[PDB]
């Protein structure tokens, strides 16, 4: 029924309120730019919604997976695309 298609959202908005405002600070310390951090946070959480094999085991630390996702994306930005222009 439709309650399930709504349950998807009600499941995401429940991890947002507990992990987004904290993940932001991590990418913040690592980039010194709150704007890029704002970008990386949404990128990360979109992937998370795309990888449900991580949140399903509620009893396991999800934040811990998130931090690594972000930490990797930041350096992907510190790639060749940054060395020349920044």
């Amino acid at each position: 029924v439709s309650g399930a298609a709504a349950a998807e959202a009600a499941l995401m908005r429940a991890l947002y309120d507990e992990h987004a405002a904290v993940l932001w600070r991590y990418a913040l310390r690592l980039t010194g730019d709150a704007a890029q951090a704002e970008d990386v946070v949404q990128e990360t959480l979109l992937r998370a919604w795309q990888h449900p094999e991580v949140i399903g085991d509620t009893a396991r630390p999800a934040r811990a997976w998130l931090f690594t996702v972000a930490r990797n994306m930041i350096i992907d930005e510190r790639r060749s695309a940054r060395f020349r222009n920044v």
Partner: protein, 49 residues
């Protein structure tokens, strides 16, 4: 005990009166949600910082 220490001043009595929330575990969370907004407030997560 607070009234015990600062009682000689009407201004401090008026502060404790005009206060909003009372309780050791109440004002603690009141500080937590003003200092680091947007996070779930645990009693120990605030007691730590």
């Amino acid at each position: 005990q607070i009234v015990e220490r600062f009682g000689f001043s009407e201004i401090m009595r008026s502060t404790l009166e005009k206060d909003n929330t009372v309780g050791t575990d109440e004002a603690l969370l009141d500080i937590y949600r003003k200092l680091r907004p947007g996070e779930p407030p645990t009693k120990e997560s605030a007691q730590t910082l």
